[PDB]
Structure 1
Amino acid sequence: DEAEASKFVEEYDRTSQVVWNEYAGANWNYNTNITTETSKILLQKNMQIAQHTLKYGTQARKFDVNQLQNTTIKRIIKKVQDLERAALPAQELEEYNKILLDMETTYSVATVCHPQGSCLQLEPDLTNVMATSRKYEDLLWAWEGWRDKAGRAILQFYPKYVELINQAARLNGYVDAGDSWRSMYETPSLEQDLERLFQELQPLYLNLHAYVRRALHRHYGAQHINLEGPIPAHLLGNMWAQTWSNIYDLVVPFPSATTEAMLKQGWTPRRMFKEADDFFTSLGLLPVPPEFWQKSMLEKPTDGREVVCHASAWDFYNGKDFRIKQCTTVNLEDLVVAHHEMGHIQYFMQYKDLPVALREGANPGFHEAIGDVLALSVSTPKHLHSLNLLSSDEHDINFLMKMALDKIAFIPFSYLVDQWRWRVFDGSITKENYNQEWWSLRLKYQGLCPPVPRTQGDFDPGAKFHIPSSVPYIRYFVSFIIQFQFHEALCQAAGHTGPLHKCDIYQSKEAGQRLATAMKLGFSRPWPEAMQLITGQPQMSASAMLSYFKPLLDWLRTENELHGEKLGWP
């Protein structure tokens, strides 16, 4: 009985590794070569994994986990009881798989065209426009056009998607898909805990917002920026106004105090990933295997192939084959993304000897945080100078501002995406109100407004990758808080004293060992245990992020007071 459960999970593990390896292959092949042939093979392999999931999930529900003694086996069996989409009847499963493929393909191949002119793709063309253009009308063209071509094209699929993902969730014991997603944290108090974290970041965000709004007023003109109102959503350097540091040049605190350098000094996608690999091994963490260099797709193909560019990290479930797929551009932003992705690979490597059911991060935010922690150190002026990419309190404030434009601005954005989705999933937001409710949250949390009134048929959420790709978002909110807790702890372990923002953990084997111990746990233990291993305490806390940015909070409050700024908006 305990012995039958044990046999049970050993069979599940051997067979799952095979079937999931085959599925991952097919998924990779489609993602790196969108065609009717790779699509067919993918939709077929979907049916194979579904059949396996159904078989072993059915058997897992036969056990009473309330009676099982071994806590590992109990946990594994409990997890395998969740069939996900494989719970759906065949007709619905087929329709759901097709909807998901159609959504992700629509997003990844959408283009925005000038008449009798060229057609731009999101990566790299529209990304580049949003980062570098300082002309209202040109930014508006890219911003609106991307929504018109990607967002509006997702709308036809989204209501049925919601029906079917919710139907699957109910068949697995949840009330809706949002309930199921939140369950990944195993934290009954999650919604309140996240809300309290968000509230703690509000002083810093409102101060940053007002400061940036002032700067935008200077460049884009008084007639286009209301100093007591929300900021137009196309002016922040990024398609979603999720991270703002591409407009650093417009907001630099101290003018008198890297892309050109990276290009001129011969950086390439492969060198960028080598740098990241080197950073991991400097901490005594694992190098990526030779296979990774052979099989990864580290730049957009030139050969014609249509691909899913949006960067991702892949585990092929055999303990050996790990890959990144990224349409890498040579710049510092993308170097940060490369490190983000390499953190996923590092996690995959660290937990590769666990049973597959426990091959996940302690929670999804932990998986998102690892690579970002290393990138915090990469980003420091000291470290960028060490890489030759660069040649005082003023310098300090400038650097904190650059960091804040990405890390603090992202907090409200990352919070809001799943506040919207949880309310779609629970039925609170119907299809008639999708776009209005998206904008009411964009206002409430980020203090943004759309530069052109939205119209019938718009579906702006569809223009953000994780929406059509059905990837949960709250993990990134969690990540952006906890990564600073990890940085604080690893900097302490490495013996750093003085301001946390001056910390660089490069070469610290003590920092590496802290992270490795936690990563090796996988999903085997409640996530607070992993939090405590790394930090010495069990909770999510904004204290570390606040500590990092303290000198900037102080500077921004003084600066905003001198200009008589009215924080917030109506």
Structure 2
Amino acid sequence: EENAKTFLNNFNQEAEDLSYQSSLASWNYNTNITEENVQNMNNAGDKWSAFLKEQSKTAQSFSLQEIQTPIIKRQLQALQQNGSSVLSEDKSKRLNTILNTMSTIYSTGKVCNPDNPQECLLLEPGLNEIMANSLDYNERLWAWESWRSEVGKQLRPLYEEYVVLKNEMARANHYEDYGDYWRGDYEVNGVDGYDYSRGQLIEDVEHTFEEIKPLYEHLHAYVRAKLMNAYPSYISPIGCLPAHLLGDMWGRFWTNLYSLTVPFGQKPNIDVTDAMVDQAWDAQRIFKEAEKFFVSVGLPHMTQGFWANSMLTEPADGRKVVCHPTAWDLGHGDFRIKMCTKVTMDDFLTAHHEMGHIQYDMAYAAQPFLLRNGANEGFHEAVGEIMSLSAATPKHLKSIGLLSPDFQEDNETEINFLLKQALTIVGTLPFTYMLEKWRWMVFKGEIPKDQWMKKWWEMKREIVGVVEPVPHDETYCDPASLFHVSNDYSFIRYYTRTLYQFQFQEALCQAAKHEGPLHKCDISNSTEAGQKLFNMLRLGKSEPWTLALENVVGAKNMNVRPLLNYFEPLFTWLKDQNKNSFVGWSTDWSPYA
């Protein structure tokens, strides 16, 4: 039995060194894009990649059932996975090549305007600006279609081989398909009453989705009525919503629709972006002020190596940087944040999400290397959101000094706030399920490749209530038009993390002894509730996610009740507005016919 105990102590000391060679090399690329750094980010990771496979096979010789201490059982299963090297020699390189070819044409994808051929825009910030601010139905129709017809159709032949090759990877790893490969994240095979099946994931997300439909169907009817004023004669009062009028490229978030669907736009806006500029704030002031939020609840400060090795601003003066905000846990106590912070309220709240990732990383640092990870794929993104939920409340903005102390918090300002939160939180729930349900069936083989796009839009209207503006045959690849689909990223984590972020908030505000509504809770000054989250952040990947969730919320599974209580004042207000409107949508209307 001790034979496996020394094996892990050999891995946990040698993997940390190799995982720091790759983690430090990956930072040198995202902070200094150079063709030379492409090799260092790759080669230092390939040596690490060749190490995990040699140790996964050596750990696989150990009899898994012949363990007795629980800390060692869970460490071996993290290495018991076969991985992706079960594929053939030549098919492993072609499958790895199409992943790059899909990831490149997603970023290199540029479309040119027929009215102005010299102007050719990219996805960011070219097409995304048109989908996020333009009000021309035809201009939004072009950017939506040109992305799916010029760069989406290029992903179609690659994605057909992407599915057939990665299914072979999963079917050889004792899985049913690549869709089953991703559902193994929530799988638990251990303590009595804490186990969880891979197929149970499908049953739970569908069961908890039914309590979301009453709230979402009223948001859909309210947004459609407001959108009928912005785009008249283009929207049916009973039909679905056009895909290009949802606020972004794919209709994932309806956040940009707040300028069109605001309940009481006459009141002063809560975007405190202007107040940050006239106070001479920089990226230092934002992260330093965010540091004060974590220290107020008992959590440690940001280490000096963080303030000295993190990229808090756009580099400038001679460098290239992937400006996507990411929180990095390189190991060896090295914690950094790579983000091109602007002097805006959106980047002010993003610093609270990304530093929330670091606080989780700093907590489980005592866990072994194999156990240093979130409870599940959605636990990390839920920890970052509960930080931004408390930081976005007016009581927190006024206490920091950004909002005016005489800001009137009427019952109408809370409806405007809950409506803005609904356009981002509850608006993405049907889109996330329908997207992952499509890939779950495509991997399952229920959707043949000669009708991938027919069933994709048949679920857009049924699940999300969204209609395509122009008909699409099978040459299109609208699913892969999103980042997570064309870059091999699971998407169900964004659905589970949303329900996790409200079970955490309700459980933490009860420990913080909050009294008002859930949307007015600020967990600042709460060293009592800060220890309650500390108890689960230190857990890491040791105990199953069912147990880590139970340590804070007291439940073994996800629950939709906290989310509905957060939007309860808005849900009652949406049912009042839609009394003379039509709640629901017809899956047969289309903007062409």
Q: TM-score, normalised by structure 2?
A: 0.89
How far apart are the structure 2 equivalents of 1:305 and 1:166? 40
Distance of aligned partners of 1:364 and 1:513 in 2 relative to their CA distance in 1, 3 Å threshold: same
Partner of 1:234: 244
Q: Secondary structure at the match of 1:315?
A: strand
Partner of 1:341: 354
How far apart are the structure 1 equivalents of 2:157 and 2:302? 41
Question: Given residue 182 of structure 1, which amino acid in structure 2 is its aligned partner?
Answer: R
Q: Do the aligned residues in 2 keep the contact of 1:488 with 1:500 (CA within 8 Å)?
A: yes
How far apart are the structure 2 equivalents of 1:133 and 1:243? 16
Counterparts of 1:346-495 in structure 2 under 5 Å?
A: 346-391=359-404, 392-495=410-513
1:143 aligns with 2:144: yes
Q: Residue 301 of structure 2 is aligned with which of 264, 281, 287?
A: 287
Distance of aligned partners of 1:23 and 1:432 in 2 relative to their CA distance in 1, 3 Å threshold: farther
Partner of 1:159: 160
Identity of aligned residues (%): 43
Question: Given residue 514 of structure 1, which amino acid in structure 2 is its aligned partner?
Answer: K
1:192 aligns with 2:191: no
Q: Do the aligned residues in 2 keep the contact of 1:152 with 1:462 (CA within 8 Å)?
A: no
Q: Secondary structure at the match of 2:328?
A: strand
> Relative to structure 2, which stretch is displaced further, 181-190 or 518-527?
181-190
Q: Deviations over 1:482-501 (max 9, x none)?
A: 11111111111111113112
Q: Residue 317 of structure 1 is aligned with which of 321, 331, 348?
A: 331
> Relative to structure 2, which stretch is displaced further, 24-33 or 548-557?
24-33
Q: Secondary structure at the match of 2:422?
A: helix
Question: Given residue 51 of structure 2, which amino acid in structure 1 is its aligned partner?
Answer: H
Distance of aligned partners of 1:461 and 1:403 in 2 relative to their CA distance in 1, 3 Å threshold: same
Distance of aligned partners of 1:354 and 1:281 in 2 relative to their CA distance in 1, 3 Å threshold: same
Q: Deviations over 1:406-448 (max 9, x none)?
A: 1110111222222122222222234433333332332222111
1:530 aligns with 2:543: no
> Relative to structure 2, which stretch is displaced further, 255-264 or 415-424?
255-264
Distance of aligned partners of 1:28 and 1:270 in 2 relative to their CA distance in 1, 3 Å threshold: same
Distance of aligned partners of 1:31 and 1:146 in 2 relative to their CA distance in 1, 3 Å threshold: farther
Distance of aligned partners of 1:129 and 1:37 in 2 relative to their CA distance in 1, 3 Å threshold: same
Counterparts of 1:262-277 in structure 2 under 5 Å?
A: 262-277=276-291
How far apart are the structure 2 equivalents of 1:265 and 1:347? 31
Q: Secondary structure at the match of 2:567?
A: helix
1:64 aligns with 2:81: no
Q: Deviations over 1:198-225 (max 9, x none)?
A: 111110000001000000001211x111
How far apart are the structure 1 equivalents of 2:152 and 2:28? 25
Distance of aligned partners of 1:331 and 1:196 in 2 relative to their CA distance in 1, 3 Å threshold: farther
1:251: how far off? 1.5
Distance of aligned partners of 1:113 and 1:485 in 2 relative to their CA distance in 1, 3 Å threshold: same
Partner of 1:208: 219
Q: Secondary structure at the match of 1:67?
A: coil
Partner of 1:544: 562
Q: Secondary structure at the match of 1:324?
A: strand
Partner of 2:230: 219
Superposed CA RMSD in Å reads 2.5
1:16: how far off? 1.3
Counterparts of 1:48-197 in structure 2 under 5 Å?
A: 48-114=47-113, 115-186=116-187, 187-188=196-197, 189-197=200-208
Q: Do the aligned residues in 1 keep the contact of 2:549 with 2:556 (CA within 8 Å)?
A: yes
Q: Secondary structure at the match of 1:466?
A: helix
1:269: how far off? 4.5
Unaligned runs of 5+ in 2: 188-195, 405-409, 588-593
Distance of aligned partners of 1:415 and 1:522 in 2 relative to their CA distance in 1, 3 Å threshold: same
Q: Do the aligned residues in 2 keep the contact of 1:103 with 1:157 (CA within 8 Å)?
A: yes
1:305: how far off? 6.1
Unaligned runs of 5+ in 1: none
Q: Do the aligned residues in 2 keep the contact of 1:53 with 1:83 (CA within 8 Å)?
A: no
Q: Deviations over 1:294-345 (max 9, x none)?
A: 4434455556866544433222232x22333344454434444333322222
Partner of 1:14: 13
> Relative to structure 2, which stretch is displaced further, 402-411 or 209-218?
402-411
Q: Secondary structure at the match of 1:86?
A: coil
How far apart are the structure 2 equivalents of 1:301 and 1:433? 46
How far apart are the structure 2 equivalents of 1:28 and 1:260? 32
Partner of 1:517: 535
Question: Given residue 561 of structure 2, which amino acid in structure 1 is its aligned partner?
Answer: S
Distance of aligned partners of 1:296 and 1:164 in 2 relative to their CA distance in 1, 3 Å threshold: farther
How far apart are the structure 2 equivalents of 1:325 and 1:492? 33
Distance of aligned partners of 1:145 and 1:293 in 2 relative to their CA distance in 1, 3 Å threshold: farther
Q: Secondary structure at the match of 1:93?
A: helix
Q: Do the aligned residues in 2 keep the contact of 1:283 with 1:512 (CA within 8 Å)?
A: yes
Q: Do the aligned residues in 2 keep the contact of 1:105 with 1:308 (CA within 8 Å)?
A: no
Q: Secondary structure at the match of 1:538?
A: coil
Q: Do the aligned residues in 2 keep the contact of 1:490 with 1:505 (CA within 8 Å)?
A: yes
Q: Do the aligned residues in 1 keep the contact of 2:53 with 2:83 (CA within 8 Å)?
A: no
Q: Deviations over 1:450-485 (max 9, x none)?
A: 223335532122221112221211111111111111
Q: Secondary structure at the match of 1:52?
A: helix
Distance of aligned partners of 1:102 and 1:264 in 2 relative to their CA distance in 1, 3 Å threshold: farther
How far apart are the structure 1 equivalents of 2:205 and 2:353? 22
Q: Secondary structure at the match of 1:84?
A: coil
Distance of aligned partners of 1:126 and 1:424 in 2 relative to their CA distance in 1, 3 Å threshold: same
Q: TM-score, normalised by structure 1?
A: 0.92
1:550: how far off? 1.0
Which structure is higher in helix share? 1
Aligned length: 566
1:83: how far off? 3.2
Partner of 1:254: 264
Q: Do the aligned residues in 2 keep the contact of 1:165 with 1:177 (CA within 8 Å)?
A: yes
Distance of aligned partners of 1:299 and 1:466 in 2 relative to their CA distance in 1, 3 Å threshold: farther
How far apart are the structure 1 equivalents of 2:105 and 2:123? 12
Q: Secondary structure at the match of 1:323?
A: strand
How far apart are the structure 2 equivalents of 1:214 and 1:19? 56
Question: Given residue 234 of structure 2, which amino acid in structure 1 is its aligned partner?
Answer: H
1:34: how far off? 5.1
Q: Secondary structure at the match of 2:365?
A: coil
Q: Do the aligned residues in 1 keep the contact of 2:22 with 2:44 (CA within 8 Å)?
A: yes
Q: Secondary structure at the match of 2:378?
A: helix
How far apart are the structure 1 equivalents of 2:284 and 2:212? 36
How far apart are the structure 1 equivalents of 2:454 and 2:439? 13
How far apart are the structure 2 equivalents of 1:30 and 1:459? 30
Q: Secondary structure at the match of 2:446?
A: coil
Q: Do the aligned residues in 2 keep the contact of 1:283 with 1:509 (CA within 8 Å)?
A: yes
Q: Deviations over 1:117-161 (max 9, x none)?
A: 444343344333333222323333333333345433433422232
Q: Secondary structure at the match of 1:489?
A: helix
Q: Secondary structure at the match of 1:65?
A: coil
Q: Deviations over 1:31-82 (max 9, x none)?
A: 4455544444444345323321221111111111112112211211122011
How far apart are the structure 2 equivalents of 1:140 and 1:521? 48
How far apart are the structure 1 equivalents of 2:152 and 2:398? 41
